[PDB]
Amino acid sequence: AASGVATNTPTANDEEYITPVTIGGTTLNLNFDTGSADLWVFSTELPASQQSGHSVYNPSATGKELSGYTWSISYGDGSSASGNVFTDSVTVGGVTAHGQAVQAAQQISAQFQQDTNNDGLLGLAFSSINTVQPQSQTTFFDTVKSSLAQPLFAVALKHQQPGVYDFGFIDSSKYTGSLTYTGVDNSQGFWSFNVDSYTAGSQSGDGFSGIADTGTTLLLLDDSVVSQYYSQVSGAQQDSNAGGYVFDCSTNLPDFSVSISGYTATVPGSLINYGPSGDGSTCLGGIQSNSGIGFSIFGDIFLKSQYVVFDSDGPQLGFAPQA
């Protein structure tokens, strides 16, 4: 059976996490994203000026076209990309997917034209939300899962340190105590789960649903919860140059926790200081608004506190404090 360890590394301020992937023999640095289901890459089909600062996929060398097939994706921050489709060999942590659909970019939006830290995305959401047309394709994980020892992957994201994506096995040294599992609702293609209650510092409230999403930097909550949290943070104010609530960098921030099937997942206040906010001398908060969408986004701020098991059997998510 197959298993492997893929090493991730945060960019500055842990904005995103990058992991190397070898496609047709070329290694690209990709953003592993449990919130989407497309494996797309910078390619030789982009204008030459947009290739600069990247490693790029050359489909002509090793790929097999899917004639007539295309892809086009849009993300929550308004970024987007599109192109055509080839199958090729894709290796992650020593585990090879043969005949994996690789979505070669022809068009990329401004955000991607400005980010030279990644060479594309590797989606790890359910394959039902893959965007390839006219027929959807499987994620790397779904392609390999029946070859793995167990049909799961697990994630340790860290603050300013390398972390892991474990494929096909659980590393019990990555967490304290035992895992607690909760049921996943895959009806919208996400790793969605329920929380029974939350604690924002000195205030608590009722539960809600949200998605485990490695591709979102922050912990995005309802505006009522965000307001409750920052009401406890002296001097907090919104700054649209920075991206939301900011505060003095020396602030002692309250913890934030959720109740997940009887387990308390706690984000220490230290992790809620995202980093310097950008002009001047404040720090951006790691908790921000979810734009009124009606569910929460358990992004990297939250995930840095946990080891998280994404198990296709169920499906289900397992949580324990990171170690």
Ligand X SMILES: *[C@H]1O[C@H](CO)[C@@H](O)[C@H](O)[C@@H]1O
Ligand Y SMILES: COC(=O)[C@@H]1Cc2cccc(c2)CNC(=O)C[C@H](NC(=O)[C@@H](NC(=O)CC(C)C)C(C)C)C(=O)N[C@@H](CC(C)C)P(=O)(O)O1
16 within 8 A of 117, measured Cβ to Cβ: yes
DSSP string, 147-158: GBSSSEEEEE--
CA proximity to 303, closest of 2, 33, 52: 33
Give the position of tokens 């602030």: 251
Under rule CB under 6 A, residue 88 binds ligand Y = no
Torsional class of 318: left (φ above 0), alpha (ψ -120 to 50), beta (otherwise)? beta
Which of 14, 33, 142, 311 is the catalytic position?
33
Give the position of tokens 């490693």: 55
Q: 4-43 mask for ligand X (x: CB under 6 A)?
A: -x-x------------------------------------
Here the tokens at position 58 are 């050359």
**Phi, psi values for residue 320, rounded to 5°:** -160, 160
Q: Select from 2-10, 28-36, 238-246, 280-288 the region that touches ligand X (CB under 6 A).
A: 2-10
CB nearer to ligand X: give 7 or 224.
Answer: 7
Under rule CB under 6 A, residue 238 binds ligand Y = no
Q: Select from 72-80, 97-105, 195-203, 302-310 the region that touches ligand Y (CB under 6 A).
A: 72-80
Under rule CB under 6 A, residue 99 binds ligand X = no
Q: 271-310 mask for ligand Y (x: CB under 6 A)?
A: --------------------------x-------------
Query: Quick check: is 88 catalytic?
Result: no
Query: Using CB under 6 A, which of 3, 34, 138, 277 touches ligand X?
Result: 3
3-state secondary structure 9-70: EECHHHCCEEEEEEECCEEEEEEEECCCCCEEECECCCCHHHHCCCCCECHHHHCEEEEEEE
Q: Select from 110-118, 161-169, 244-252, 276-284 the region that touches ligand X (CB under 6 A).
A: 161-169
CA proximity to 154, closest of 97, 214, 95: 214
Which of 88, 142, 166, 213 is the catalytic position?
213
Q: Select from 1-9, 45-53, 68-76, 213-221 the region that touches ligand X (CB under 6 A).
A: 1-9
CA proximity to 107, closest of 46, 38, 53: 46
Under rule CB under 6 A, residue 173 binds ligand X = no
Here the tokens at position 319 are 């949580």
Name the binder of 5 from ligand Y, ligand X, none, CB < 5-8 A by kind: ligand X
Query: Quick check: is 213 catalytic?
Result: yes
Q: Select from 33-41, 99-107, 253-261, 305-313 the region that touches ligand Y (CB under 6 A).
A: 33-41
**Phi, psi values for residue 178, rounded to 5°:** -105, 150
Here the tokens at position 102 are 């690789």
Name the binder of 321 from ligand X, ligand Y, none, CB < 5-8 A by kind: none
Query: Using CB under 6 A, which of 151, 201, 243, 321 touches ligand Y?
Result: 243
Here the tokens at position 103 are 């979505």
CA distance 117 to 64: 27
270 within 8 A of 233, measured Cβ to Cβ: no
Under rule CB under 6 A, residue 162 binds ligand X = yes
Query: Using CB under 6 A, which of 11, 22, 58, 76 touches ligand Y?
Result: 76
Applying CB under 6 A, the residues found at the interface with ligand X are 1, 3, 5, 7, 149, 162, 168-169
Residues forming the active site:
33, 213
Applying CB under 6 A, the residues found at the interface with ligand Y are 15-16, 31, 33, 35-36, 75-77, 79, 121, 213, 215-218, 220, 243, 297
